[PDB]
Design an enzyme around this catalytic site. Structure first.
Site, PDB file in Angstrom:
ATOM      1  N   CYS A 155     -18.805 -19.134 -14.459  1.00 13.71           N
ATOM      2  CA  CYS A 155     -17.763 -19.350 -15.497  1.00 13.71           C
ATOM      3  C   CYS A 155     -16.410 -18.762 -15.090  1.00 13.71           C
ATOM      4  O   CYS A 155     -15.441 -19.034 -15.802  1.00 13.71           O
ATOM      5  CB  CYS A 155     -18.229 -18.803 -16.837  1.00 13.71           C
ATOM      6  SG  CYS A 155     -18.254 -16.994 -16.922  1.00 13.71           S
TER       7      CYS A 155
ATOM      8  N   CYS B 287     -17.349 -13.878 -12.398  1.00 11.83           N
ATOM      9  CA  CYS B 287     -18.576 -14.704 -12.537  1.00 11.83           C
ATOM     10  C   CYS B 287     -18.379 -15.962 -11.692  1.00 11.83           C
ATOM     11  O   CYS B 287     -17.333 -16.609 -11.835  1.00 11.83           O
ATOM     12  CB  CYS B 287     -18.849 -15.041 -14.000  1.00 11.83           C
ATOM     13  SG  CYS B 287     -20.275 -16.133 -14.293  1.00 11.83           S
TER      14      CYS B 287
ATOM     15  N   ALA C  10       0.857  -1.209   0.000  1.00 14.27           N
ATOM     16  CA  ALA C  10       0.000   0.000   0.000  1.00 14.27           C
ATOM     17  C   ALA C  10       0.877   1.237   0.000  1.00 14.27           C
ATOM     18  O   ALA C  10       0.357   2.287  -0.362  1.00 14.27           O
ATOM     19  CB  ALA C  10      -0.952   0.032   1.187  1.00 14.27           C
TER      20      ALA C  10
ATOM     21  N   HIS D 155      -4.838 -10.021  -2.972  1.00 16.35           N
ATOM     22  CA  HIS D 155      -6.003  -9.652  -2.140  1.00 16.35           C
ATOM     23  C   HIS D 155      -7.181  -9.200  -3.031  1.00 16.35           C
ATOM     24  O   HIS D 155      -8.225  -8.849  -2.471  1.00 16.35           O
ATOM     25  CB  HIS D 155      -5.572  -8.633  -1.061  1.00 16.35           C
ATOM     26  CG  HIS D 155      -4.396  -9.074  -0.245  1.00 16.35           C
ATOM     27  ND1 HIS D 155      -3.561  -8.179   0.471  1.00 16.35           N
ATOM     28  CD2 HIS D 155      -3.887 -10.314  -0.057  1.00 16.35           C
ATOM     29  CE1 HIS D 155      -2.642  -8.859   1.066  1.00 16.35           C
ATOM     30  NE2 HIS D 155      -2.822 -10.200   0.723  1.00 16.35           N
TER      31      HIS D 155
HETATM   32  N1  LIG Z   1       6.136   6.523  -0.250  1.00 14.39           N
HETATM   33  C1  LIG Z   1       6.573   5.468   0.440  1.00 14.39           C
HETATM   34  N2  LIG Z   1       7.825   5.028   0.194  1.00 14.39           N
HETATM   35  C2  LIG Z   1       8.281   3.957   0.863  1.00 14.39           C
HETATM   36  N3  LIG Z   1       7.684   3.233   1.805  1.00 14.39           N
HETATM   37  C3  LIG Z   1       6.440   3.681   2.014  1.00 14.39           C
HETATM   38  C4  LIG Z   1       5.830   4.766   1.412  1.00 14.39           C
HETATM   39  N4  LIG Z   1       4.552   4.913   1.916  1.00 14.39           N
HETATM   40  C5  LIG Z   1       4.397   3.913   2.745  1.00 14.39           C
HETATM   41  N5  LIG Z   1       5.532   3.175   2.887  1.00 14.39           N
HETATM   42  C6  LIG Z   1       5.720   2.003   3.747  1.00 14.39           C
HETATM   43  O1  LIG Z   1       4.916   1.024   3.149  1.00 14.39           O
HETATM   44  C7  LIG Z   1       4.475   0.061   4.144  1.00 14.39           C
HETATM   45  C8  LIG Z   1       3.067  -0.345   3.835  1.00 14.39           C
HETATM   46  O2  LIG Z   1       2.772  -1.563   4.565  1.00 14.39           O
HETATM   47  P1  LIG Z   1       1.334  -1.840   5.173  1.00 14.39           P
HETATM   48  O3  LIG Z   1       0.679  -0.570   5.622  1.00 14.39           O
HETATM   49  O4  LIG Z   1       1.412  -2.938   6.184  1.00 14.39           O
HETATM   50  O5  LIG Z   1       0.618  -2.370   3.813  1.00 14.39           O
HETATM   51  P2  LIG Z   1       0.767  -3.810   3.093  1.00 14.39           P
HETATM   52  O6  LIG Z   1       0.499  -3.701   1.641  1.00 14.39           O
HETATM   53  O7  LIG Z   1       2.088  -4.305   3.528  1.00 14.39           O
HETATM   54  O8  LIG Z   1      -0.423  -4.505   3.894  1.00 14.39           O
HETATM   55  C9  LIG Z   1      -0.684  -5.916   3.744  1.00 14.39           C
HETATM   56  C10 LIG Z   1      -2.173  -6.136   3.783  1.00 14.39           C
HETATM   57  O9  LIG Z   1      -2.669  -5.784   5.098  1.00 14.39           O
HETATM   58  C11 LIG Z   1      -3.934  -5.165   4.988  1.00 14.39           C
HETATM   59  O10 LIG Z   1      -4.793  -5.661   5.962  1.00 14.39           O
HETATM   60  C12 LIG Z   1      -4.368  -5.429   3.535  1.00 14.39           C
HETATM   61  O11 LIG Z   1      -4.990  -6.681   3.305  1.00 14.39           O
HETATM   62  C13 LIG Z   1      -3.032  -5.345   2.797  1.00 14.39           C
HETATM   63  O12 LIG Z   1      -3.086  -5.905   1.480  1.00 14.39           O
HETATM   64  C14 LIG Z   1       4.720   0.704   5.511  1.00 14.39           C
HETATM   65  O13 LIG Z   1       5.718  -0.003   6.203  1.00 14.39           O
HETATM   66  C15 LIG Z   1       5.251   2.119   5.202  1.00 14.39           C
HETATM   67  O14 LIG Z   1       6.364   2.428   6.010  1.00 14.39           O
HETATM   68  N1  LIG Z   2      -3.573   0.796  -1.662  1.00 16.61           N
HETATM   69  C1  LIG Z   2      -4.598  -0.021  -1.439  1.00 16.61           C
HETATM   70  O1  LIG Z   2      -4.714  -1.087  -2.059  1.00 16.61           O
HETATM   71  C2  LIG Z   2      -5.605   0.335  -0.382  1.00 16.61           C
HETATM   72  C3  LIG Z   2      -6.914  -0.131  -0.464  1.00 16.61           C
HETATM   73  C4  LIG Z   2      -7.844   0.203   0.512  1.00 16.61           C
HETATM   74  C5  LIG Z   2      -7.472   0.999   1.573  1.00 16.61           C
HETATM   75  C6  LIG Z   2      -6.166   1.485   1.670  1.00 16.61           C
HETATM   76  N2  LIG Z   2      -5.782   2.288   2.723  1.00 16.61           N
HETATM   77  C7  LIG Z   2      -5.234   1.150   0.680  1.00 16.61           C
HETATM   78 ZN   LIG Z   3     -20.294 -16.196 -16.738  1.00 17.31          ZN
END
Ligand SMILES: Nc1ncnc2c1ncn2[C@@H]1O[C@H](COP(=O)(O)OP(=O)(O)OC[C@H]2O[C@H](O)[C@H](O)[C@@H]2O)[C@@H](O)[C@H]1O
Ligand SMILES: NC(=O)c1cccc(N)c1
Ligand SMILES: [Zn+2]
Ligand SMILES: [Cl-]
EC number: 2.3.1.-
Length: 282
Positions: free
Chosen positions: A135, A132, A44, A124
């Protein structure tokens, strides 16, 4: 869903001092040049520079809910533009420097950036995508699909079917798409470089996949402002804004970051476009 383990949240940011950061990004450059099969793992943190809050960053969704505060969107999912990093990953695929993209992100921006879906694992799911039940046909929509939790959307399949269309957004209990995960897993095992960008690697199995590259001598690079579960297992950790790192990396590789024409879907990766000849390294 209320009791869910949301892991560690709002850990301090690390900033590599400029001299160490510039050195580190040249070293990433080096590894990309030496690597036959480069896999990027996104989360994210690569979408924070487009107005989308992360989950466990200082002002992340989980971090703020813990403090009793709201995360802040500075865009809609529809109005969000792929970042420099997003468009850097497009070009890295186009010039044959990126074998596979594994994303935890549901923000849809990888698909909208024009990145080819047969090289993307969306572990995710995707807010713009419905499937669907009958299918399994997928539709990439121009508006976010209003449900989350693999529920019925209210639309029906149009395969020359009338089957129930559902969202692709996994709730806490749902296991990851078998196809995307299989492809993500094989991609990660076979890679000789896995670079993680803006993820904390705390969620299984998404955050473990990069570690699979470390079987049979693979290198791991973690790009993240905050610490991550597997920081210890990285050959290179770069603490800096992912847009800065990738814009320096691109420039080292002699690659421009391509114009975003607005929302486009590409299903299938093309043959590699030309790219500069590689430096003498040793
Ligand atoms: N501009 C940036 N540059 C570098 N690092 C960054 C920046 N902005 C944010 N960060 C870092 O980016 C990191 C973002 O990590 P997390 O917030 O855990 O997101 P995930 O994708 O790992 O979350 C996993 C799943 O959890 C959820 O429940 C959903 O299901 C997600 O899919 C942080 O450590 C920031 O320091
Ligand atoms: N960057 C993302 O996939 C996402 C989706 C929903 C909520 C947030 N905070 C981030
Ligand atoms: Zn279909
Ligand atoms: Cl949800």
């Amino acid at each position: 869903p209320f009791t869910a383990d949301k892991g560690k949240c709002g850990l301090p940011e690390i900033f590599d001092p400029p001299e160490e950061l510039e050195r580190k990004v040249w070293e990433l450059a080096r590894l990309v040049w030496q690597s036959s099969s480069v896999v990027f793992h996104t989360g994210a943190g690569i979408s924070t520079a487009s107005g989308i809050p992360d989950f466990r960053g200082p002002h992340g969704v989980w971090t703020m809910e813990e403090r009793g505060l709201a995360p802040k969107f500075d865009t809609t999912f529809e109005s969000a533009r792929p970042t420099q990093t997003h468009m850097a990953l497009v070009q890295l695929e186009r010039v044959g420097l990126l074998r596979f993209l594994v994303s935890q992100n549901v923000d849809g921006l990888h698909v909208r950036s024009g990145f080819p879906r047969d090289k993307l694992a969306e572990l995710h799911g995707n807010m713009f995508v419905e499937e669907c039940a009958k299918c399994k046909t997928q539709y990439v929509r121009d508006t976010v699909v209003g449900t989350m939790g693999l529920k019925a959307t209210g639309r029906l399949c149009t395969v020359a079917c009338r089957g129930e269309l559902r969202d692709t957004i996994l709730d806490w209990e749902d296991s990851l798409p078998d196809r995307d995960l299989a492809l993500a897993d094989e991609a990660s095992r076979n890679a000789d470089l896995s670079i993680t960008l803006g993820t904390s690697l705390q969620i299984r199995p998404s955050g473990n996949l990069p570690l699979a590259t470390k079987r049979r001598g693979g290198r791991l690079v973690i790009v993240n402002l905050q610490p991550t579960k597997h920081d210890r297992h990285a050959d290179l950790r770069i603490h800096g804004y992912v847009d800065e790192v990738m814009t320096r990396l691109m420039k080292h590789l002699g690659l421009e970051i391509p114009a975003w024409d607005g929302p486009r879907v590409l299903e299938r990766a093309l043959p590699p476009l030309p790219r500069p000849p590689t430096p003498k390294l040793e």
